[PDB]
Amino acid sequence: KYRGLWFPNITPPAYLTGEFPADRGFDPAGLAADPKVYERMRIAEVFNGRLAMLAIVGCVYPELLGNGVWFEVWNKVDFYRFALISLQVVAPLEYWRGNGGFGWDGEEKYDRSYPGFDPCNLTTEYTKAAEIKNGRLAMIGMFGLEVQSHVTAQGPVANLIEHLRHPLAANIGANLAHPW
Amino acid sequence: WTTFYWHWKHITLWQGNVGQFNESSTYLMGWLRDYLWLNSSQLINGYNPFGMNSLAVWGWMFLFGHLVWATGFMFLISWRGYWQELIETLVWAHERTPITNVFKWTDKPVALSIVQARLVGLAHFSVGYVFTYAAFLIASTSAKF
Amino acid sequence: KRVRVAFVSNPVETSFEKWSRPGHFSRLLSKGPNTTTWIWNLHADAHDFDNHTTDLEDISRKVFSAHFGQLAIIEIWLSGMFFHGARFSNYEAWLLDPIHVKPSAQIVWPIVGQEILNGDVGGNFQGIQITSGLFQLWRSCGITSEFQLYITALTGLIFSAVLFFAGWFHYHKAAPKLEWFQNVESMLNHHLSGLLGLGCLSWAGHQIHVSLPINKLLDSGVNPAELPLPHDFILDKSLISQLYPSFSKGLAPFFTFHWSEYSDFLTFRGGLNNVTGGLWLTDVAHHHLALAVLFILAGHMYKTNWKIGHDIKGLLESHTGPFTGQGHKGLYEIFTNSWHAQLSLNLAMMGSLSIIVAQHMYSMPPYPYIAIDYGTELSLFTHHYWIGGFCIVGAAAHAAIFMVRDYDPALNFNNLLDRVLLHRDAIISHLNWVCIFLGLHSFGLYIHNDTLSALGRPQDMFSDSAIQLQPVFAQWIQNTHYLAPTLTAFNLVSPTTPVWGGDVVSISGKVAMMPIKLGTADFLVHHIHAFTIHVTVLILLKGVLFSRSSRLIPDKASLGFRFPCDGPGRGGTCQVSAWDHVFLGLFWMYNSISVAIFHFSWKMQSDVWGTVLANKVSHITGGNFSQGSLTINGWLRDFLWAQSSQVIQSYGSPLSAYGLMFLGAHFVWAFSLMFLFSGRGYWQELIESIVWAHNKLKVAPNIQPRALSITQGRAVGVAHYLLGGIATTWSFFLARIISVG
Amino acid sequence: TKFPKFSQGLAQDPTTRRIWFGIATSHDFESHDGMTENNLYQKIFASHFGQLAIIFLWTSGNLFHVAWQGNF
Amino acid sequence: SHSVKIYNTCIGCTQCVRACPTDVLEMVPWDGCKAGQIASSPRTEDCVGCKRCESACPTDFLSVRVYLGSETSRSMGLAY
Amino acid sequence: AWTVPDLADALKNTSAVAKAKGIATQLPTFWELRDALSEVPKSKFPEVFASYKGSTGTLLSAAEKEEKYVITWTSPKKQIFELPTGGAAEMEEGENIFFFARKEQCLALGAQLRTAFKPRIENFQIFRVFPNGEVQYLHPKDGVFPEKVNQGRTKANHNPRSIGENAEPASVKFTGTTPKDVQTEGAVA
Ligand code: CLA
Ligand code: CLA
Ligand code: CLA
Ligand code: CLA
């Protein structure tokens, strides 16, 4: 099980053996040294990633369609109604995800990271790594969107188009040199 | 040739200017210019950027005829082996593309036969010939009368 | 040492004997005719040198000598153009009034009424208006007299004789050996540094010393009769000093590397002259001089006789990565033993170069007064586009001849060429998908618009006033090219052309160049172009990769490059050969170029060419391309039907020859279908009944009439189709743009 | 497969040829498998009745649509 | 399957046999010609219908003759 | 004498069978190759690539479900030949085995073996292999190449007339026969 590392000549932690997808020997802050936490962290990493992937497409695509910018949506949409209705809808779904099924004791023991919602039988220890890596990329992206929202105060497609039109007058250097 | 002559001869008699046919019909640029080119003006304006009139159906059937006639030339000019070798590569791509493979044919895809394609070419050619002329004949006569 | 001239004296005897023995070159043809098939075979097989002999030395010799004959015929053709220009033209009249006099260099004799073709072109002259750009090219050279045109035409005829001589000499008297021909590093060094390097230096020399003064004086209205002759600029340095004062410093700046002293004739301004509408000749001089330096440098890169330089075989063998097996190994042997491989690569490049020439010469008009000659502009674009398409299809032909005739499996084991052939079903199948996808999402959009227009729903159309498809990348590129003189090409004054943006260049009233803007219509045509090129690659590449074998026929190579079929079994195997792929690619190249030149003609007539009054620009078709081109009906109505009025109303005028050529070409095109849609079984049985009647009246011929072969029928069919199609467009284009513009 | 049932040769073909050549030979009754002169004349006679009915239905539809939707 | 028949005008030149790409024909002994061999077609289930044999035959109106018939996967030349 | 050979005796040589299976496999899906490259360091990248040895011209699914063909021969030297399915391969000194999907591809390679090598290879044997496991020997069917006349062969599909002596189709109408199969000696199915 050869695997690459996140920084050239480092040595991986001893609890990261490559046994799991998208392991690149990266845990300097030692947050997965205990195995049971490493189990939950693994579920959390895939779930934050999946949500960032949905989020970043959700943030970009309506702005491409001219339906508005993602961080200005709350002057046309009421947040509190949206969030009430969303939590009503989401709650039994999240419940069942954490529960492992519909039963009170779990019963119908399902994988809460990788359930079988796959009609194309595409699941391998490789596609798992691709899902993780795409997710990590999207999480970094959604971090970018939020910081860019605050610093430049324009949307992300606008930010891209500005960089393409004026690469020297629209970059992190120029935008942070000024008061912002 | 017989219907073009009948049409142009009547269209000029009915409009009164039989001179047009008498003068122009002796050379082929006359047929092209004073029959085909001139009497296609309203037909090809059936739908324009400004709007559309009831000649828009014959306009569209006129271009449809052009397309069906031209599609017949593919069958009449390119012959079978070309297509049999291309279809072999598509059968390979279907068999080797994952997920999709599970859809299997019951009848092995092959290229049309030699006679078959002569017939299909002739049928495209005939339908387009008829549909184009009927569009032109009805739209031109109905436009001016 | 190693690179050396090596030859053989007197290897072939000059005699008219074999001239009197047709077919001599073939073992089969030399037995004489028995059927008419022989005659056709004699013409079809004449230049196929690798089917005459097996010796590669004898083939190389024939090739070299044939090349001299081609140069001789080109030189006759040029000499003709100069002579017609000196003796039957209005070049001296046009030189006084370029804007009003129309260039003409073909007069017709009065017989049977044809004198009507001698039109009123100006300069007290009657003749046929020419659209080749010669007069503008001559003016740019500095030619002002007919005497100079005469001298050039005589020198060229002598030079043509000398080249015919060289061909005879280098074949019959002193023929090089194969070792000579195989010195590819010497050849590259000489052709880059000598032919292109010194050629550019020499021509920069002519420009600096002859074309720049004479044009500078002429653009300041100096009447060509009282211009100095070109040597006068060389002998008297005071003449050229008045125009460019740097010459007063002579060659001292050059040798002390103070080259900035020559910045008055070696500029970098960019854009068009405001008087002539051409590029600035001082730029053209700097361009050619910079090229010279780079070509002379480049030709110093390969090793010949002196221990410095790169070895090409090494260079190729060095570049090998992991996906590609043994990599570029074996190619050096292919490119120094196969003439067909070289001819393939060189035709692909020559064809691609012709198309680049076409696209670069309309946007950056290089000759004085050529941009406001709209007939020239349209002609040269179209000409160079056709030449390009033909060469590319030839490149595919000769590649397939290489695979069938000169491919050695042994010398190509697990290199790139072998790996290509191991995944040829993946290559063709992906190309197939891309072609279907581009077909549906491009021509499907026109069918969409036509249908929704006809249904009375124009707000559902793909249009600039509807569902927009904007070409945003090309717009981005245009903007960047327009701003370039301010940061990324700082030392440039103006951008390379008005096309990128800015103001209208207009000589007299007429527009030379003006910005070309892109929107939905430009998007759809561009994706139609991408579709038709992809399909042509699909047909040609399939023919090259499946030339030796396929699932259908395992032993195609043994049947050869050109064979009609392998019989009616396996479902039918008509047209499996690689030759038959070149035949179908000719039709798709015809379709592709035809759409491109229609795009150009309509876009230029609608959005660039016209007349300026103050600042308002009145285009020839009044901006109907942007809306009118979004349906097939609009292409038929606003282009084909409307712009065809000039050619069909040309009888009784000096444009009537275009009217006749328009009908004649429609005829030849339809005649081609008799060959393309039938087969020789029918014709051979009809010829049997005709041969009966000749037999009954004892006048049957001894050379037995045979119907043409399958291959020849296909060849005749595509020849007459391509001729009739292209000539039709030629008539229609010239009659239109000679009348209106 | 099964279609076309009048030709075993075609109905053994494992390709898409079977379909196309099945449609194109369906009315050529002489070339059908195990065709006799009696059976040939009797299928011709019936098909003739079928053509007649199609013609009378066509006329009936012209009359109907003109009576219902026209302006006679 | 296609049907390949041999007629008595054969002169036993073996050219058809050499031409055939799917080994359908062979030479068997005969006394009707000087070469003392005739062509025969035992394996006509393997005939693809190419008619290469008829192109090879040098007799005036061929002695070998291929009548195309019903298609199979073998006769249709299919690798799928 | 000559006896009908067996593929089993040919297939005993495990190296030659391995090679045959190697070469008659399809090229891998991009996904699979990506995974293989993913499990090795960079230095070992060409070894992964060197592990594939097939093409896209090889057997598809019909071979598994209908029939495949096998050619065997013995070469005197290690030499490169051209596959009838596109591309090149190496014959080893000794026994070679190769799988193909049609009989025409087999015989095409056979034809190349008998023309394009300086010690000519004449000893190839072609077999048809069914999915169940029956192996039918095909060529040369009786030990002698079919262009050479051999005793024991019989006439098949001989018509004892010239072609002009066939009947007219209008004379055998509604009888179930054609003119071409009247009085045919050795009429096969
Ligand atoms: C001047 C007299 C002369 C004579 C008597 C010979 C004699 C011979 N040559 Mg040599 N040759 C000559 C000049 C001569 N050549 C020149 C000038 C060159 C340079 C081109 C050559 C280059 C050459 C080569 C490469 C070969 C020969 C060969 C031969 C032998 C056979 C030639 C033959 O039968 O074709 C007679 C053919 C013609 C009369 C056709 C001429 C086509 C000319 C070149 C171009 C015409 C294009 C024209 C403008 C038409 C365009 C289209 C039209 C519709 C307008 C014969 C010994 C051949 C040989 O050795 O075979 C073994 C051979 O391969 N010669
Ligand atoms: C530098 C360019 C170049 C060169 C040197 C060659 C050389 C050759 N070609 Mg290649 N080829 C080229 C470009 C070239 N070709 C291009 C552009 C195409 C695409 C059209 C081809 C497509 C091609 C094919 C398909 C074949 C060749 C073949 C050949 C070989 C024999 C040619 C022959 O005997 O014809 C003798 C010449 C003729 C019969 C003249 C034909 C006249 C044409 C059809 C009409 C011209 C019309 C005219 C311009 C205008 C109208 C005339 C007027 C009277 C109405 C020869 C090696 C052949 C081969 O197999 O060799 C292995 C072959 O089959 N070529
Ligand atoms: C107008 C005449 C015509 C047409 C329409 C075609 C069409 C085609 N040719 Mg043929 N061809 C022609 C003349 C024509 N050819 C001629 C004259 C020859 C010379 C002999 C050839 C020789 C030839 C060769 C050699 C090849 C082609 C290929 C193709 C296919 C290209 C792939 C493609 O674009 O499919 C997309 C289909 C079209 C663009 C056809 C129109 C489809 C319409 C717009 C859609 C129909 C409505 C649909 C029901 C709507 C669904 C969506 C909607 C609800 C939103 C295509 C089927 C190539 C091919 O098959 O490669 C894959 C190929 O290799 N052709
Ligand atoms: C025989 C030729 C014929 C044709 C071409 C048509 C055509 C049409 N009918 Mg009409 N129809 C017909 C006979 C015909 N009808 C007769 C005889 C009656 C009286 C029973 C009707 C009663 C009728 C009604 C109430 C309506 C139509 C309508 C229509 C239009 C849409 C199709 C439809 O909805 O009909 C559906 C079909 C029927 C209701 C019954 C049709 C009975 C005929 C005989 C069908 C068989 C035709 C033919 C023999 C089949 C052979 C073809 C085969 C070889 C491939 C279409 C113009 C609709 C309309 O007006 O839209 C504007 C509509 O509402 N038709």
Distances, alpha carbon F176 to alpha carbons A163, D31, F182, in Å:
83, 10, 11
Distance CA B105, CA B103 (A): 7
Task: Check if the beta carbon of residue C88 is closer than 8 Å to that of residue C107.
Answer: yes
Distance CA C145, CA C260 (A): 35
Using alpha carbons, select from C593, C552, C605 the residue that is nearest to residue C574: C552
Q: What angle do CA C516, C521, C523 make, to 5 degrees?
A: 85
Residue with CA nearest ligand 2 atom 24? C397
Distances, alpha carbon C373 to alpha carbons C275, C379, C740, D46, in Å:
14, 10, 11, 74
Q: Is the distance from the beta carbon of residue C676 to the nearest atom of ligand 3 less than 6 Å?
A: no
- Residue A3, both tokens: 């695997």
DSSP, collapsed to helix, strand or coil, labels residue D15 as strand
Distance CA C373, CA C98 (A): 10
Distance CA C83, CA C143 (A): 13
* Ligand 3 center to C435 CA (angstroms): 9
Task: Check if the beta carbon of residue C270 is closer than 8 Å to that of residue C494.
Answer: yes
> What are the strands of the beta sheet with F68-75, ordered from one edge?
F94-100, F68-75, F125-129, F135-139
The verdict on whether omega for the bond into residue C471 sits within 30 degrees of 0, i.e. cis, is no
Q: What radius of gyration, in Å, describes the C-alpha atoms of chain A?
A: 20
> Where is F70: in which H helix or E strand?
strand F68-75
Bridge partners (DSSP) listed for residue B62:
none
The number of angstroms, rounded, from the C-alpha of A45 to the middle of its chain's C-alpha atoms is 8
Q: Choose the closest CB to E76 out of C554, C566, C571.
A: C571
Q: Entry resolution in angstroms?
A: 2.8
Distance CA C577, CA B81 (A): 9
Residue with tokens 């490493």: A38
**Beta carbons within 10 angstroms of residue F134's beta carbon:** 9
Considering every ligand atom shown, identify the ligand nearest to the alpha carbon of residue C65 and give its number. 1
Helical packing angle, C443-454 and B56-77, nearest 10° = 150
Backbone φ and ψ of E39, nearest 5° = -80, 155
DSSP, collapsed to helix, strand or coil, labels residue F24 as coil
* Per-residue exposure over C143-155, b if at least 16 CB sit within 10 Å of its own CB, e if not: bbbeebbeebbee
Task: Check if the beta carbon of residue C633 is closer than 8 Å to that of residue B41.
Answer: no
Distance CA C237, CA C312 (A): 47
- Residue B136, both tokens: 């032109």
Amino acid at C60: S
Q: Is the distance from the beta carbon of residue C48 to the nearest atom of ligand 2 less than 6 Å?
A: yes
- Residue C212, both tokens: 């720049």
Q: Determination technique for this PDB entry? A: cryo-EM
- Residue D18, both tokens: 């079977």
Using alpha carbons, select from E51, E42, E41, E1 the residue that is nearest to residue E21: E51
Distance CA C657, CA F155 (A): 71
DSSP, collapsed to helix, strand or coil, labels residue C590 as helix
Task: Check if the beta carbon of residue C680 is closer than 8 Å to that of residue C37.
Answer: no
Distance CA C738, CA C740 (A): 6
Using alpha carbons, select from C445, C726, C714, C471 the residue that is nearest to residue C593: C726
Comparing alpha-carbon positions, the chain B residue that sits nearest to C456 is B52
Tell which phi-psi region holds residue E12, choosing left (phi > 0), alpha (psi between -120 and 50) or beta.
left
Distance CA C541, CA C397 (A): 10
Distance CA C585, CA F119 (A): 42
Residue C306's contacts (CB-CB under 8 Å, 6 or more residues apart) are none
- Residue C144, both tokens: 């002002």
Q: Is A135 exposed, middle or buried (0-12, 13-18, 19+ CB in 10 A)?
A: buried
The number of angstroms, rounded, from the C-alpha of B5 to the middle of its chain's C-alpha atoms is 20
Q: What angle do CA A132, A134, A139 make, to 5 degrees?
A: 90
- Residue C38, both tokens: 């022989």
Residue with tokens 């280098």: C170
Amino acid at C212: L
Interchain proximity B95–F29, CB inside 8 Å: no
Backbone φ and ψ of A113, nearest 5° = -110, -45
Distance CA E12, CA C529 (A): 58
Bridge partners (DSSP) listed for residue E67:
E3
The number of angstroms, rounded, from the C-alpha of C272 to the middle of its chain's C-alpha atoms is 25
Distance CA C642, CA B37 (A): 10
- Residue E69, both tokens: 């018939």
Distance CA E74, CA F138 (A): 15
CA distance B30 to chain E (A): 51
- Residue C307, both tokens: 């221990």
Distance CA C146, CA C155 (A): 14
DSSP, collapsed to helix, strand or coil, labels residue C483 as helix
Residue with tokens 């292109």: C196
Distance CA E9, CA E16 (A): 14
Q: What angle do CA C158, C162, C168 make, to 5 degrees?
A: 145
Where chain F is broken, by preceding residue (C–N > 2.5 Å)? none
DSSP string, F104-155: HHHHHHHHHHTTS-SS-----EEEEE-SSS-EEEEETTTSS-TTS--TT---
Three-state SS string over D32-68 comes to CCCCCHHHHHHHHHHHHHHHHHHHHHHHHHHHHHHHH
CA distance F131 to chain B (A): 19
- Residue C415, both tokens: 């290199």
- Residue C706, both tokens: 């045979």
Task: Check if the beta carbon of residue F187 is closer than 8 Å to that of residue F181.
Answer: yes
Distance CA F99, CA F129 (A): 10
Distance CA C98, CA C135 (A): 9
Using alpha carbons, select from C534, C544, C540, C537 the residue that is nearest to residue C399: C544
* Ligand 4 center to D67 CA (angstroms): 14
Half-sphere exposure of C551 (CA within 13 A, CB side): 28
Tell which phi-psi region holds residue C524, choosing left (phi > 0), alpha (psi between -120 and 50) or beta.
alpha
Residue C697's contacts (CB-CB under 8 Å, 6 or more residues apart) are none
Helical packing angle, B56-77 and C656-677, nearest 10° = 50
DSSP string, chain A: -----SSTT----TT--S-STT--S--TT-TT-SHHHHHHHHHHHHHHHHHHHHHHHHHHHHHHTTS--GGGGGGTS-HHHHHHHHHHHHHHHHHHHHHTSSBTTB-S---SSS-S--TT----TTHHHHHHHHHHHHHHHHHHHHHHHHHT-S-HHHHHHHHHH-TTTSSHHHHHHS--
Q: Please report residues of D whose CB lies closer than 8 A to that of E80.
A: none
Chains D, A in contact, 3 or more Cβ pairs below 8 Å: no
CB of D38 within 8 Å of any CB in chain B? no
Q: Please report residues of E whose CB lies closer than 8 A to that of F155.
A: 6, 28, 30, 38, 40
Using alpha carbons, select from C165, C197, C191, C557 the residue that is nearest to residue C342: C191
Residue with tokens 């209005």: C90
Residue with tokens 């891309």: C434
- Residue F104, both tokens: 């025409």
Bridge partners (DSSP) listed for residue C35:
C704
Task: Check if the beta carbon of residue C463 is closer than 8 Å to that of residue C520.
Answer: yes
> Where is C201: in which H helix or E strand?
helix C199-206
- Residue C732, both tokens: 């229609």
Distances, alpha carbon F76 to alpha carbons C461, F7, F87, F113, in Å:
71, 21, 22, 12
> What are the strands of the beta sheet with E3-7, ordered from one edge?
E64-67, E3-7, F158-159
Q: Is C740 exposed, middle or buried (0-12, 13-18, 19+ CB in 10 A)?
A: middle
DSSP string, C367-420: STT-TT-HHHHHHHHHHHHHHHHHHHHHHHHHHHHHHHHS--STT-SSSHHHHH
Give CA torsion, residues F117, F123, F124, F126, to 10 deg: 160
Backbone φ and ψ of F134, nearest 5° = -65, 140
Amino acid at E13: C
Task: Check if the beta carbon of residue B110 is closer than 8 Å to that of residue D17.
Answer: yes
Q: How far apart are the first and last CA of chain C?
A: 62
Q: Is F113 exposed, middle or buried (0-12, 13-18, 19+ CB in 10 A)?
A: buried
Q: What angle do CA A36, A40, A45 make, to 5 degrees?
A: 140
DSSP string, C348-367: HHHHHHHHHHHHHHHHS--S
Amino acid at C615: N
- Residue E58, both tokens: 């040098």
- Residue C702, both tokens: 């001894």
Bridge partners (DSSP) listed for residue E29:
E37
- Residue C438, both tokens: 């581009």
Total length of chain F: 189
- Residue A84, both tokens: 């009430």
Distance CA E46, CA E4 (A): 11
Amino acid at C427: I
Distances, alpha carbon F101 to alpha carbons B6, B9, B89, C252, F67, in Å:
62, 66, 15, 79, 7
Amino acid at C300: H
Q: Please report residues of A whose CB lies closer than 8 A to that of C479.
A: 165
Task: Check if the beta carbon of residue B62 is closer than 8 Å to that of residue B135.
Answer: yes
> Where is E5: in which H helix or E strand?
strand E3-7
Residue F73's contacts (CB-CB under 8 Å, 6 or more residues apart) are F91, F95, F96, F113, F121, F123, F124, F125
Tell which phi-psi region holds residue C330, choosing left (phi > 0), alpha (psi between -120 and 50) or beta.
left
Task: Check if the beta carbon of residue C206 is closer than 8 Å to that of residue C143.
Answer: no
Q: Please report residues of F whose CB lies closer than 8 A to that of D35.
A: 174
Distance CA C252, CA E36 (A): 97
Distance CA A36, CA A26 (A): 18
Task: Check if the beta carbon of residue C599 is closer than 8 Å to that of residue C529.
Answer: yes
Residue with CA nearest ligand 4 atom 41? D61
Residue C410's contacts (CB-CB under 8 Å, 6 or more residues apart) are F79, F80, F88
- Residue C671, both tokens: 């005649």
Distance CA F98, CA F20 (A): 5
Q: Choose the closest CB to B113 out of C546, C572, C717.
A: C572
Task: Check if the beta carbon of residue C449 is closer than 8 Å to that of residue B63.
Answer: no
> What are the strands of the beta sheet with C119-120, ordered from one edge?
C104-106, C126-129, C119-120
Half-sphere exposure of E25 (CA within 13 A, CB side): 33
Total length of chain A: 180
Distance CA F166, CA F178 (A): 10
Helices (H), C463-519: 472-483
Distance CA C24, CA C41 (A): 12
Backbone φ and ψ of C698, nearest 5° = 50, 45
Distance CA C400, CA C716 (A): 21
Distance CA B37, CA B45 (A): 13
* Ligand 3 center to C441 CA (angstroms): 12
